[PDB]
């Protein structure tokens, strides 16, 4: 009906098509937990092997978020500089939010390579403080019990942010952001879920965690670089320079 009800539907559809893992599958698999043996198996792998596994999973996760963006109304009519600026600042913020779906707060486990495991799975990477910050962020998001439509609309707003430094057509990003803000508010009101607004992470916290993650990924990429077929080569070239 309204341009806004369609925008809600097209964001939720984009998300459904790019969500990478199905929520019912992730909820169904929570009982499928790595044994002590499988865990010491991961812990004994080289840093460089665990880095190769985790780098490729994270790159693929980023590629689902790039596709999500490309399918948001108006994203493809932004100039290429602004597309790169938004995804560079936002795509890994969206991956970190998407993680909460694959996270079980009851035993603090994440779905990884077909089973749930704790952060000790990743010991060989020697990243314990950063990995702990990532699990704690997922742990605090788990309390919101995001619906699929909430996660879709919230992650759209994570990407479409006119405050990112470097934008060339700030007013064009503002028009998309305000339509998505109205879509999000409208949807929460229609579903009696406005209470999540007071509980969303402070913007500073997501940007800060994302900044520490990407800096650590860039250090590993520097020491032991992986390659992938770039989904968005201009963005890829600006991360893997
Ligand atoms: O397929 C692509 O076009 C593409 C695929 C991935 C990205 C992208 N990688 N990335 C990383 O942090 C990253 C990852 Cl996930 C794995 C290994 C090394 C890295 C690092 F070198 F960049 F640090 C990002 C952060 C923020 C935003 C986009 C990306 C960008 C583009
Ligand atoms: C927290 C750990 C370790 C990160 C290690 C470091 C800091 C070197 O990158 C990472 C490794 C792999 C990541 C998952 C990859 C894919 C997905 C699917 C996506 O839909 C949601 C996020 C998730 C589950 C990632 C979570 C973070 C993981 C476990």
Curated annotation (Swiss-Prot):
It is found in: Nucleus. Isoform 1 is widely expressed in many tissues, including liver and adipose, and highly expressed in skeletal muscle. Isoform 2 is primarily expressed in immature thymocytes. A motif (AF-2) lies at residues 235-240. Induction: Up-regulated in the state of obesity. Residues 3-241 form the NR LBD domain. The AF-2 (activation function-2) motif is required for recruiting coregulators containing LXXLL motifs such as NCOA1 and NCOA2. Nuclear receptor that binds DNA as a monomer to ROR response elements (RORE) containing a single core motif half-site 5'-AGGTCA-3' preceded by a short A-T-rich sequence. Key regulator of cellular differentiation, immunity, peripheral circadian rhythm as well as lipid, steroid, xenobiotics and glucose metabolism. Considered to have intrinsic transcriptional activity, have some natural ligands like oxysterols that act as agonists (25-hydroxycholesterol) or inverse agonists (7-oxygenated sterols), enhancing or repressing the transcriptional activity, respectively. It is linked to Immunodeficiency 42: An autosomal recessive primary immunodeficiency characterized by increased susceptibility to concomitant candidiasis and mycobacteriosis. Candidiasis is characterized by persistent and/or recurrent infections of the skin, nails and mucous membranes caused by organisms of the genus Candida. Mycobacteriosis is characterized by infections caused by moderately virulent mycobacterial species, such as Bacillus Calmette-Guerin (BCG) vaccine, environmental non-tuberculous mycobacteria, and by the more virulent Mycobacterium tuberculosis. Interacts (via AF-2 motif) with the coactivator NCOA2 (via LXXLL motif). Interacts with the corepressor NCOR1. Interacts with CRY1. Interacts (via AF-2 motif) with the coactivators NCOA1 and PPARGC1A (via LXXLL motif). Interacts (via AF-2 motif) with PROX1. Interacts with FOXP3. Interacts with NR0B2. Belongs to the nuclear hormone receptor family. NR1 subfamily. This is Nuclear receptor ROR-gamma. The gene is RORC. The chain holds residues 267 to 507 of 518 of the full protein.
């Amino acid at each position: 009906l309204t341009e806004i009800e369609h925008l809600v539907q097209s964001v939720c559809k984009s998300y459904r098509e790019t969500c990478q893992l199905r929520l019912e599958d992730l909820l169904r698999q929570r009982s499928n937990i790595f044994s002590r043996e499988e865990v010491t198996g991961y812990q004994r792998k080289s840093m460089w092997e665990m880095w190769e596994r985790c780098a490729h999973h994270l790159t693929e996760a980023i590629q689902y978020v790039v596709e999500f963006a490309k399918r948001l109304s108006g994203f493809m009519e932004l100039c290429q500089n602004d597309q790169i600026v938004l995804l560079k600042a936002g795509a890994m913020e969206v991956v970190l939010v998407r993680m909460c779906r694959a996270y079980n707060a009851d035993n603090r486990t994440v779905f990884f390579e077909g089973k749930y495991g704790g952060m000790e799975l990743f010991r060989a990477l020697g990243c314990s403080e950063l990995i702990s910050s990532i699990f704690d962020f997922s742990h605090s998001l788990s309390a919101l019990h995001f619906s699929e439509d909430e996660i879709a609309l919230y992650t759209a707003l994570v990407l479409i942010n006119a405050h990112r430094p470097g934008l060339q057509e700030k007013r064009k990003v503002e028009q998309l952001q305000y339509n998505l803000e109205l879509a999000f508010h409208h949807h929460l009101h229609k579903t009696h879920r406005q209470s999540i607004l007071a509980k969303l992470p402070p913007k500073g916290k997501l940007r800060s965690l994302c900044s520490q993650h990407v800096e650590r990924l860039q250090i590993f990429q520097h020491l032991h670089p992986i390659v992938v077929q770039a989904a968005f080569p201009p963005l890829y070239k600006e991360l893997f320079s």
